[PDB]
């Protein structure tokens, strides 16, 4: 906090640093698990066109700098974005009469659904501790 105040003093008020919101980690883990399922959380919001979690500006974690924590959370949000977007791409479900990708593609998407099921199983296997 002292260093951020010093940086703001040096920046002469021009760098409106987003206010560091201190959140308990025992919550950050929940947000991470939601990201692993592509779910937006209080700190990470889902950008629908990108199917991507967006970190809330000014996330502060105890014991770490809010900027470094934000960087870590940005990487985790990128991973969650990849998971959710890949799920959506693979989520093309039914070989309806409008399905033009053929049976080989449909079987590929079935295998991908199996893979994503295994991924979900792994995510659920992740202990929240």
């Amino acid at each position: 906090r002292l260093h951020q105040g010093e940086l703001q003093l040096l920046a002469g008020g021009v760098l409106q640093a987003p206010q560091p919101v201190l959140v308990k980690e025992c919550e950050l883990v929940k947000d991470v698990l939601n990201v692993l399922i592509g779910v937006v959380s209080a700190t990470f919001s889902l950008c629908q066109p990108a199917q991507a979690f967006v970190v809330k500006r000014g996330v502060h974690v105890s014991g770490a700098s809010p900027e470094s924590i934000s960087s870590l959370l940005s990487e985790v949000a990128e991973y969650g974005t990849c998971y959710t977007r890949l799920s959506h791409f693979s989520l093309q479900p039914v070989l309806d009469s409008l399905y033009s990708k053929g049976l080989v593609f449909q079987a590929f998407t079935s295998g991908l659904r199996r893979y994503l099921q295994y991924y979900r199983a792994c995510v659920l296997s992740t202990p929240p501790t």
Binding site: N34, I37, V39, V40, P93, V94, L95, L103, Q106, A107, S110, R113, Q117, R120, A121, V123, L124
Partner: protein, 133 residues
């Protein structure tokens, strides 16, 4: 509305992840309701012996599905079901119910009855070349 899958309204104050899981599972419940309705209606003698027998087999499978659903309810009562575990367990049920609803909707759109119902079942079996179940 018609021979369509049932749509559901979810309480807006639910957790977004819970609401999305509910909306993902509800398609299975709607398909199950449609298949059970088709089985119970077309099992009447007026639908002909072929359509009646198909509906009866669907009704038996719906009974097995209800048994499965009751077992899932029991698992929920034990607290051993997580949202990801719930989603995984309903995924096979979701796909089976979706196949059953697609067959029901194909019979209904074709108004398939008796031998026509057998034609619709054959055409659905050819349509399920990629779906062994």
């Amino acid at each position: 509305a018609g021979r369509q899958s049932r749509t559901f309204l979810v309480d807006p104050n639910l957790d977004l992840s819970i609401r999305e899981l509910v909306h993902r599972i509800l398609p299975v419940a709607a398909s199950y309701s449609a298949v059970t309705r088709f089985i119970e209606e077309k099992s009447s003698f007026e639908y002909g012996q072929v359509n009646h027998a198909l509906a009866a087999a669907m009704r038996t499978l719906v009974k097995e599905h209800l048994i499965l659903v009751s077992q899932l309810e029991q698992l929920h009562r034990q607290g051993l079901l997580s949202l990801q575990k719930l989603w995984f367990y309903i995924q096979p049920a979701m796909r089976t119910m979706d196949i059953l609803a697609s067959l029901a909707t194909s019979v209904d759109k074709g108004e398939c009855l008796g031998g026509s119902t057998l034609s619709l079942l054959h055409d659905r079996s050819f349509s399920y070349t990629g779906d062994s179940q």
